[PDB]
Amino acid sequence: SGLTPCSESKGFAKRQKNEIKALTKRLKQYEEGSAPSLALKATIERTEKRFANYGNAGLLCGTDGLPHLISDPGLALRFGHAGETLIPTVGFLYIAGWIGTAGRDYLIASKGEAKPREKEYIIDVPLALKISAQGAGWPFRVIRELQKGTLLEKDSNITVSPR
Amino acid sequence: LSDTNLVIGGATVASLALGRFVFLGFQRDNAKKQGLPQQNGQSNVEAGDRLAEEASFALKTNDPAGFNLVDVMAWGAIGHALGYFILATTSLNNTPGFDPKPF
Amino acid sequence: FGIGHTMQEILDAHTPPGGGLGAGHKGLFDTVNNSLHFQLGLALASVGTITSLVAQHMYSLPPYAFLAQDFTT
Amino acid sequence: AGNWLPGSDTPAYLDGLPGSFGFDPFGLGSTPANLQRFQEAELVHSRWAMAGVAGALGAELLGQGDWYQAPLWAVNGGAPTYLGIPVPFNLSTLLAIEFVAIAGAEAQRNAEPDAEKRKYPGGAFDPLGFSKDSKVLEENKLKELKNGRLAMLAFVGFIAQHAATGKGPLEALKLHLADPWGANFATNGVSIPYL
Amino acid sequence: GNWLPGSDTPAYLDGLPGSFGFDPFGLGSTPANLQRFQEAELVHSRWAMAGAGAEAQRNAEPDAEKRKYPEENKLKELKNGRLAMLAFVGFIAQHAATGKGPLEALKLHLADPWGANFATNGVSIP
Amino acid sequence: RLWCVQVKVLRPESYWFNEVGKVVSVDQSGIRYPVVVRFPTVNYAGVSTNNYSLEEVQEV
Amino acid sequence: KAGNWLPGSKTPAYLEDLPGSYGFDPLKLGEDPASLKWYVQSELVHSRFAMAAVAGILIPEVLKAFGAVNLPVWYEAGKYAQESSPIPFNTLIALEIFAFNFVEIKRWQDFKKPGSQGEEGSFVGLEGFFKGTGENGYPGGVFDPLGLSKGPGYEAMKLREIKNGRLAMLAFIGFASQYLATGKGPIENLLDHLSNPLANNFTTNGTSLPAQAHPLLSVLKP
Numbered sequence A: 001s002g003l004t005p006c007s008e009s010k011g012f013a014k015r016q017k018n019e020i021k022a023l024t025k026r027l028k029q030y031e032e033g034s035a036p037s038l039a040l041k042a043t044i045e046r047t048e049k050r051f052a053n054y055g056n057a058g059l060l061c062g063t064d065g066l067p068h069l070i071s072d073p074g075l076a077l078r079f080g081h082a083g084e085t086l087i088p089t090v091g092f093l094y095i096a097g098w099i100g101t102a103g104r105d106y107l108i109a110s111k112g113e114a115k116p117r118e119k120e121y122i123i124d125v126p127l128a129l130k131i132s133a134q135g136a137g138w139p140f141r142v143i144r145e146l147q148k149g150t151l152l153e154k155d156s157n158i159t160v161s162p163r
Numbered sequence B: 001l002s003d004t005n006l007v008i009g010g011a012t013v014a015s016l017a018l019g020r021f022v023f024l025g026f027q028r029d030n031a032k033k034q035g036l037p038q039q040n041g042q043s044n045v046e047a048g049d050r051l052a053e054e055a056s057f058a059l060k061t062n063d064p065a066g067f068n069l070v071d072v073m074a075w076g077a078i079g080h081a082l083g084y085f086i087l088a089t090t091s092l093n094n095t096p097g098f099d100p101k102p103f
Numbered sequence C: 001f002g003i004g005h006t007m008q009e010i011l012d013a014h015t016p017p018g019g020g021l022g023a024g025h026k027g028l029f030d031t032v033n034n035s036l037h038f039q040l041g042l043a044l045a046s047v048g049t050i051t052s053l054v055a056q057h058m059y060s061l062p063p064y065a066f067l068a069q070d071f072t073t
Numbered sequence D: 001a002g003n004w005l006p007g008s009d010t011p012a013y014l015d016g017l018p019g020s021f022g023f024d025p026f027g028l029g030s031t032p033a034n035l036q037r038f039q040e041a042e043l044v045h046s047r048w049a050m051a052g053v054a055g056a057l058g059a060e061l062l063g064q065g066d067w068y069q070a071p072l073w074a075v076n077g078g079a080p081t082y083l084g085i086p087v088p089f090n091l092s093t094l095l096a097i098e099f100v101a102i103a104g105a106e107a108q109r110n111a112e113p114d115a116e117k118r119k120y121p122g123g124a125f126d127p128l129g130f131s132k133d134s135k136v137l138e139e140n141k142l143k144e145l146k147n148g149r150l151a152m153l154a155f156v157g158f159i160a161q162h163a164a165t166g167k168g169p170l171e172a173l174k175l176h177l178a179d180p181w182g183a184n185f186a187t188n189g190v191s192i193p194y195l
Numbered sequence E: 001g002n003w004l005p006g007s008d009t010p011a012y013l014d015g016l017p018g019s020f021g022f023d024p025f026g027l028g029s030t031p032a033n034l035q036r037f038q039e040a041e042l043v044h045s046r047w048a049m050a051g052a053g054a055e056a057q058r059n060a061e062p063d064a065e066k067r068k069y070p071e072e073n074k075l076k077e078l079k080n081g082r083l084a085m086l087a088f089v090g091f092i093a094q095h096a097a098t099g100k101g102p103l104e105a106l107k108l109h110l111a112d113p114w115g116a117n118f119a120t121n122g123v124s125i126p
Numbered sequence F: 001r002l003w004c005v006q007v008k009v010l011r012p013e014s015y016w017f018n019e020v021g022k023v024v025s026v027d028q029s030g031i032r033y034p035v036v037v038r039f040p041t042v043n044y045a046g047v048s049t050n051n052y053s054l055e056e057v058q059e060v
Numbered sequence G: 001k002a003g004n005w006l007p008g009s010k011t012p013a014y015l016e017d018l019p020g021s022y023g024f025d026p027l028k029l030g031e032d033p034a035s036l037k038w039y040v041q042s043e044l045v046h047s048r049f050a051m052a053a054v055a056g057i058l059i060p061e062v063l064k065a066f067g068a069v070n071l072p073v074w075y076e077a078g079k080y081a082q083e084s085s086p087i088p089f090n091t092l093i094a095l096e097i098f099a100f101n102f103v104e105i106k107r108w109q110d111f112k113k114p115g116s117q118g119e120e121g122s123f124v125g126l127e128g129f130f131k132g133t134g135e136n137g138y139p140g141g142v143f144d145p146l147g148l149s150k151g152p153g154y155e156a157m158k159l160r161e162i163k164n165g166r167l168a169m170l171a172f173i174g175f176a177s178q179y180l181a182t183g184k185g186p187i188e189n190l191l192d193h194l195s196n197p198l199a200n201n202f203t204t205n206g207t208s209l210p211a212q213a214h215p216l217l218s219v220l221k222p
Ligand code: CHL
Pocket: G074, G075, G076, G077, G078, G079, G080, G082, G089, G092, G093, G096
C-alpha cells in the first residue's frame, strides 16, 4: 500500500522522541528517588520498549508515522504480517467457539432436568466448570455434530409465525 | 457499389436470408409459445384495451413461408445495425492513432 | 405486430429445474402488474439507488464546467 | 464401463449411459432433462474438440505453425493461406460465411425432437453403416466419448500451457522431453504461484 | 514343488503349469486376473528368452488356451523363461551399477570373486 | 387423542405452532375444540394451556 | 484394557476394547463412534509417520555420535539434500502432492468402505494387493509382506505399535521444540543434560519460561 516499515519511518522516530521529551519535561520538577520520578521513569522505559517492539515486529507505518495493520490473508502470509490480524483471528475464533460450545452444552444438559429454568439463573457451578473445561475440544465435537446431523434442529420442530 | 454499399447491403441481405430460411421456424414457434401479452388470464384487448388489438396487416403476407412486413423491418434493422457496426469498427481501425486491440 | 417477448411467459419460464427456487417466478407477472405498491416499491428502490449513484459520480466525475472549484456547491 | 473412484457409491441415474463411470459428484445430472441436454452437450463438445485438436496438431505438423499464430494475419495485416496456397477472402467475409453455415447447421440440429438422434443421428451422417450392428455401435459410443474427453482435456491443456509459458504445444513437448524433471507445470512461475 | 517348503500354497494355484505355489499377495485369487496374468508371464518370459498387427492378432481369438499356448515342456518353458527375465533385469541393473557390459563383468567376477561384486561397488550399497 | 399423549400443534396462529404439548383431556360432547393441551412454555399472556380441534393436533 | 491413565478415575466404556487404551479421553472427543473410528486411523497414521521420522533422525544422530556416519543434522538436511538433488524443489512438491493425493484417497476409500480397494476391477488388475483385513487401520497385503499379522503375537504387536507410536510422536515434538529453544541437535541436548541435569534443562534455555511472565527468575538467583 505504499507504506514504509516503522523501523525506518521518520515519523515513527519523531513520535517516539516527542513522547519521551514530553515525559522528560514532566520529570524535571521532582527530586530523584521520589515516587513521581520513579513512575515517570518507568513510563519512559515502557515507551522506549514499546517503540522498539513495534519496530521489531515488522509493522508498516503510514505517512502519519503510525503503525497500519495488514488484514488480507494473502498479503499477511507472504510479507510477514500474520501476527497482526490472521493469527488473532484464529485465536479469537477458537475462544469464541469454546464459549459458545460450553454455553450450548450447559443449556442442553439443563434441558433434561426436572426444573430446567432453575439452572439458568442458579448456576450448577461444578457442572459449569466441567463443561467449561471440555470446551477446549469444541471444533472436533461440533464438526462431528454437523456431519451427523445433530447440531441443527429440524425445521418441522421450530415454531414460526403465519406467513 | 462502394464499401458502404457492400457492407450495408450484404449485411441486410444476409440478415433477411437468415430470417427467411434459417431462423423462421425458431422465431415462429417461440412467438407461438410466448403468445400475446396478458393480464389476469386475458389478452390486453380482451381485458378492455382497444389500443392493444393485433394489427391486421402484420399476419397475412402472401409470402409462401409467411414472411411478412414486420419480419422484413426487424431483419433489415438487424442487418443495418450489423453493417454499421462493421463499417464503424473498420473506420476506427483504419484511422491512424487508434488501436483497440489488447496487444 | 406479432414479434417481441411476453413478460408473463418469460417469468413463468425462469424456474430452475432442480427445484432450488420452488415454483420460481411463476405468477409474478400478475403479482407485480396488479399491485401499485409493488410497482412503487420497485420504482423507489431503483430511483433512490440511482440518486445515490448520481451523488457518488458527480463529485468524482464532475460533468459541469467550473463545478469542481465551487466547493460549497 | 467402470468406476471413476473405485469403491465409491455411484449415482443410479448414470447407470447404463454410454461412457458412464459414475462421475457426477456435484449432482448436476440429478435432473433428467438436464442429464439429456448434458449428454448432447458432452457429445458436441467431444466432437468439436477432437476435430479442433486434430487440426491444431496436424496443421503444425505440416509446417503451417501452431494453433496460436493461425489467426494473427488478420491483426498483423497479413493474408490467409492454406498449405501455402493463398485464400481469397478477408476476415469479415470469413465471419459472415462461418456464421451463416454454422447457424444453418446448428438450427437444423436443434429442431430434432428425438432424443437419440440429437446425440446419435446417423443416416446421412453415417454413410459407412457402423450403426448396422448394436454390439459394434455400443462400444463405439464408449470409444467416441473417451476419445472426446481426452481431446477436451488436450485442448484446455493447449490453452493453459500457452497462457503459462507462451510456447506452442509441440515446442512445449520438446521442452519437457529435453528436461522432464526441470521443465513442467511446477517449474513455470504461473501454475503454482507461491513456488 | 514348493517355493517355501512347509508353506501352504493356495488352492487356485494347484494344477497350473509351472506352479511352485508362489503367490504371497494373492493377485491371482480371481480367475479373470489369473488367466490374464498367465498370458503376461508367458509373453514376458518369451520376450526375455529371445533378448502392432502381431500383438493385435494375439488377443483376437476368443479362446483361453490359445492366448497362452497357441505338460512337462510347459514347466520346462516356465522354469527357463523366469531365469531369462531374471537375467535381463540383472543385465540392466549391472550395466546401471558398473557401466560395463554383461560379458566382461563375468570375467571380472571370475578373475576376482571376492573383491568385485555388487557389494563392493558404490551403487548397490551406498 | 389419548390422555397424556404428546401431540404437535398445527394451528398457525397458535403460539405453540409446530411445538409439542401434552393432552390433558378430550371433551366427548361434540364441542368445537375438544382437545385440551398443556405446554411446557408460557405464551405472551402467560398461559400454558389451550384447546384444539382434532384436525389441529397430530399425535407424535 | 491396557490400564488406567488416572488410577481411581471412571474410564469411558467406549474405549474398553481398543488396542492401546488407557481410558484417556477427558475431552470426550471419541464419544461418538464414527469419530472414534476416524481418530483411531488418525492416531495410527500419526504414529507410523512419527515412528519413521524419529528413526530417520535418531539413528543417523546415534551413528554420528558413534563416529560411524556424518550425515547432516535433521533441521538442516533439507538444504543440503536440495542442492545435490537432481529434481528441483517445485517438481518435488508437485510429485509429492500427486503421489499422496493418490495413496491417501485410496486409504480414505478403504476407510469409508472396507475391502473396497481389493474388489475385482477396483485397481488395474493388481487389486489383490489391497484386500484389507476388515480392521480399521491395519491394511495388510503388500503392507504385511511377511504375514506376521496372521501369527499369535498380533494383538501384542498392535499394542507395541501404538505405545511406540505415542512415544515417537512426543519425541519428534521434543526434537522440534528442543531445536527451537536451544539451537542444537537432540544428542547434544541429551549430552548437555547428562553433564549437568540440574542446570541444563528447559528452565534455563531462556525460552520455555519467558522472563516477563516469570519475574522471580531474575530475582531468585545468585
Ligand atoms: C513434515 C514436513 C516437514 C517439516 C516439519 C520440515 C521442516 C523444515 N525443513 Mg523441509 N520440512 C518438511 C518437509 C519437506 N521439506 C522439504 C524441503 C526442504 C528444503 C529444501 C529445506 C527445508 C528446510 C526445513 C527447515 C526450514 C524451516 C521451514 O522452512 O519451515 C517449514 C515448516 C514445515 C512444518 C514444513 C512444511 C509444512 C508441512 C509440514 C508440509 C506437509 C503438510 C501436508 C502436505 C499437508 C497435506 C494436507 C492434506 C490433508 C491434504 C525446517 C526444519 C530448509 C532449511 O533448513 O533451511 C536451511 C531447507 O533449506 N525443507 C520437502 C521437499 C519438498 C518436504 C516434503 O514434504
